[PDB]
Design a protein around this nucleic acid. Sequence first.
RNA 1: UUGACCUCAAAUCAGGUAGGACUACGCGCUGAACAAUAAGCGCAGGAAAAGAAAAUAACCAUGAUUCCCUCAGUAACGGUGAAGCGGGAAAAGCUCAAAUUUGAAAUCUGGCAACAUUUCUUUUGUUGUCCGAGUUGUAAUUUCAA
RNA 2: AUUGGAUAUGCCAUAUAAAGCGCUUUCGAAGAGUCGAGUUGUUUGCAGCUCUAAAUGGGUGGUCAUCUAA
RNA 3: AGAGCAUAGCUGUUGGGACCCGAAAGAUGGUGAACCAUCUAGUAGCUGGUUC
Lengths: 166, 164, 92, 52, 198, 116, 98, 161, 75
Amino acid sequence: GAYKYLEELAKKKQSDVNLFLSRVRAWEYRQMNVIHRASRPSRPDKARRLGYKAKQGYVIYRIRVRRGRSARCTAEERVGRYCSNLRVLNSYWVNQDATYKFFEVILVDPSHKAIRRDPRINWIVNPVHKHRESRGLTSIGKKSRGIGKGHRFWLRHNTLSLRRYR
Amino acid sequence: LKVPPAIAQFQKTLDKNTATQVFKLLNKYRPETAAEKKQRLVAEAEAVANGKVSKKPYNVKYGLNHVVALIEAKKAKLVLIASDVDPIELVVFLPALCKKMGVPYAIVKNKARLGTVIHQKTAAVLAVTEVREEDKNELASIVSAVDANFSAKYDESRRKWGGG
Amino acid sequence: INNTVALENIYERIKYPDDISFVENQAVTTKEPIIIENVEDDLARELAFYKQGVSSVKAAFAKLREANVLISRPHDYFAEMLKSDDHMEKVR
Amino acid sequence: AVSEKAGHQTSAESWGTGRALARIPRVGGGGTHRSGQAAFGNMCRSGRMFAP
Amino acid sequence: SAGFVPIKQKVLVLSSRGVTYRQRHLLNDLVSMMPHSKKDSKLDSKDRLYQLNELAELYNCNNIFFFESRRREDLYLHIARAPNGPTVKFHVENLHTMDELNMTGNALKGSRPILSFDKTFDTAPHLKVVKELLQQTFGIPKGARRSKPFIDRVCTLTIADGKIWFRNYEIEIGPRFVMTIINILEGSFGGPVIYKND
Amino acid sequence: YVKTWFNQPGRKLRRRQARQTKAAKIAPRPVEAIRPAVKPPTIRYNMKVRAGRGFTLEELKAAGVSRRVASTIGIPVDHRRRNRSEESLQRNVERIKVYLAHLIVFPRKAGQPKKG
Amino acid sequence: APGLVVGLNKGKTLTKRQLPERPSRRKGHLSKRTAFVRSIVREVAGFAPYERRVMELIRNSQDKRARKLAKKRLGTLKRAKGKIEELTSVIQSSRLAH
Amino acid sequence: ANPRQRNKQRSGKPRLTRRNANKKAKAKIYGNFVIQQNWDKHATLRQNYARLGLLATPNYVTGGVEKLYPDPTLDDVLDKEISIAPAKTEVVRQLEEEAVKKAARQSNKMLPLSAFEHAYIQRLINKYGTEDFESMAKDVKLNSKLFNGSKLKNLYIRMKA
Amino acid sequence: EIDAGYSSDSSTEDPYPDYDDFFTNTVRETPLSSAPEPKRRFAPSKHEQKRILQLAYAIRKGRILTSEQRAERER
RNA sequence: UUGACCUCAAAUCAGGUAGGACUACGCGCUGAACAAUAAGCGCAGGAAAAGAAAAUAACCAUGAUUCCCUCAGUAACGGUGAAGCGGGAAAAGCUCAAAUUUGAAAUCUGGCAACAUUUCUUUUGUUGUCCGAGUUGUAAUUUCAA
RNA sequence: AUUGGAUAUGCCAUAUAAAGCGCUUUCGAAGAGUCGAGUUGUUUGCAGCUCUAAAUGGGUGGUCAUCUAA
RNA sequence: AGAGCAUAGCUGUUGGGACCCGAAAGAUGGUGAACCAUCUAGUAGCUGGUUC
């Protein structure tokens, strides 16, 4: 397959090929809008493993945020507000420079029939997933609030529990 | 600007004459259309519905994952890479993988032209794996032409940073 | 465990040059055993070791001043001092 | 049990000490007879009963 | 080649992942008092400690100060002579940081201290080894950077009740903590055990 | 905040009504699945035997029940647990085997095309 | 009858069993295809600016400075030692080819 | 007290009263018809399971049990075969009787062959006999689908019956 | 010994090289994958046979017009 | 040139969808005073969140999450203050990315035409055909327990 | 009157199919501006900034055990 | 040649608003230096009162 080569090339982010493409595309993305639609993901390997399928109902959006809260968390929220009818699936890092960090956000149309008839993404149609990025339910949102398993990661200790027979 | 050698190599494409001869062989091995496939299958359906064993089909191979797997298996005799893939890193390794596997390869123009062979809007890479006995000499002559007009040519140019 | 013979060989092998003076080697052992014997009274032992330490310091200071290298720190000479802003404020 | 806000729903403040009246807070505003009436206390009418 | 402008004693100060605030507090301190020490990053391994010899050769530091953290509750300082030499492992007790108001021994930073060791070090051959390694490391050798010619600090060392007191003096320099011996090995962070303190 | 337990007898009744609600749906099969027998993981408790989460794959293979059949007849599977000793294996293999002896599995209707 | 007796004990007798290796413990093992993919990409992608400088020092036999630069960039020693070994073999393969 | 609740107190409209309060009444049984017929509606589910001879829990019970009246080695665990269990109640016998009789009714597991399946296997047999299935699978001309010897063996077996 | 010295680097006291093929200069002669070839590549496609049976079914049920009766409807 | 592809736009074009309100409980962000404190801002549901171990342990080992009891006012820290085990309630497991369907894109939305179906003339589908999506990858298969 | 899960039974069933178990002279891909390092802030976690990986590797624990993140 | 454990009451004591009424606030967010709402039952060694 070609996603093995694409994903091992994405680890050498400052190599000659990757550095030239980082600087060429960073200039191109700056001429576009702050949030602009992407015809296809700039990282087809990374979007594919984050839940993206090349089918109707899946949308890729690019957004630049200023460097200097989590940068990826704000990209998910800003795009979610821009496309209020879509559900933010996931997001990832595509490019950066001295000023901006560029992210691509995967959104899913909960009203398209190709989404509502697909059991593997049928879950995002339910109302409990309205604005997942707004409640810290995405991948970076969950990581932001320290959700995980282990010792590395209140109300039930500030209350007096008085039983009936005590 | 200055471009790395792995991206600079895509500006040196196959010449018009050799590319035109390449697509003459490719157009003999186009995959059957969605309509032609349905006609063939319904024809066999009537022979089953009423009452009643073939040869292996012949067509050009397409798809990026499919073609890369064929090169790694050394099943491809000729690999034709589009010169204008929108993310270039999709095919930026293909000339190197084809060099490592000893696969005759060429960079042709207009990824749209590649898609037209396969009845698609767009194809990133086409690969001829194995053709009929009638076209063995035609493919062999093309592979020799690609060796001279693409591999013998350039080559020293593909190791130099382009642009600037 | 507690191999005295092996430990003695290691001590001699890594031993500093005895010819180096107390000021030269920056080491002058206390003349008498440390008076800090009150384990329970650590504060008293701290003052008890203060007299032993100062006596060793004073004896070494005379030895240090003897071989040039002025033992007394010159106030005019603004040598780097281990006095952080928080540490100096905490001291005062 | 009584309500967790009974006798404290109104808004009042202590007018001061030495003004020829008890220093218990008196409900502010005007137009209603609550003006000057005391609350937030067991003795005052419509006030917090001691130890709810 | 091997080195230029040689200095007698050069230390290397490191810590392990999980060091608490007080553990890294003292690590920030001991770096200040001896300037001939190199402050490195955290060590990834916890049972491949032989790499500290490779690190020491890289920075040409003959002494190693590994403030290992165990269970995030205890500090086990390892002092060792980097090329071969012995490795000594002290447990730290009764911490006294710089930020505490009891800190009153304002001495000259980089000034060569006078190290006074009690006869308790000379009582046993192994305690002599502890004295020597402690003397070479804490003592600031001549020619090092930030070194000062004037003498404004005097180190006083004593094993009281079998456990070392750090009573360095300018007045207490500030680090007052116990160095309880545990074991000494024949090699640099390795080799068979030759001492068990018990 | 002070937590009060006035709904303690109302939770008891509500939980019992759920057991009755569950039993009405699944009339003859047990309201609980069979659990393995394990030993707690400390020197304070390793002498005691308590109930586990599910049976290991090596325990199911010895008993003769596949890991796909097991879930369908009320036998939980624990892919995480393993048998470091032969006593844990035999203690729970017998537990599965006894369970199969006392079990009646009602037959299911199967779709059966005409030919082929 | 099906029934679990909880408490007391079941048996102090022990017989240690040999367990096989789980598939998750196989992770990190290098594949014949992943090793091929990485060799192709490493050549195609090129080298980072810090990898170019490190490669220069190794070419001039200044390994002490090379290891120091790799550790200062990567962060730890075993990451620096691995990178130096990877780049040293790149030089050796380049010299054999060229 | 709420403005919303005071609003319906001040209205003339009646409340949406729903009379659903029915405590102490237990859920009625569906699913199995045999259990439903023999299930009494007053007893608990523990009392009914015990009366019908079934087990409510295959594990321990985390409490006491009611007392209404005063009472008056791996080889032998792996190679063993437990001899099922007797039915203590007529209900359990009724459940067991239904399961065996229904399983006997649904027992036709062997399958016939279709027109293509029969002609396929018949042509292979006419050339390679009926015992050499390994050479039967290796004949590309007649075994177009490339069925192995085990699939061809099962085809012949289904043709016999 | 390590002499505890300094190496003049301690803090205390081609921009565009040519492409180098150090791996692809030689040609790999064997296929990358040693996995066995499945039988599906030497036998008629089972995906098409699925559709053929599905089409043959609906021809019997009259859902799809047969080729002979397709022409008659056209004219 | 015709003509494909990529763009960039347009339409009172067709089908959709978001806003506001409530906010006891819930999940984020932010934050003083006398603490994830009130407030402030953002976002849900009938529950939410969490969730099938980059988890504990050091044992004869345990086995997703959640809640209760206990551990325990303990370790640790500098008065704050857990967690493992243990006892209960409830229990259910799974889905992708990374493989060539390559002897056959086997996948999907929509238009149109019939045929059904309904909590319902209001709902929800089926079959056929055409167009589009899709090879820069849609199905089948696989998820380490393999 | 509206419904749910079963039972019984008629019809239809694209099975040339699809599964579990068993056996191996054949194979077995595993998520990166992440992990991690330095440093600066918020309340260890999190966040910024500089740097930036590996492949029996990596994480967390006591050579060993356990787990398999992004 | 173990006297504890549990519950109830009494009394004393330490926390919570802590016998009641009492001292300028401050902070957050609003409305037109001011005003309003909440935190707040903020802080009291002191004042007055504290029932057969």
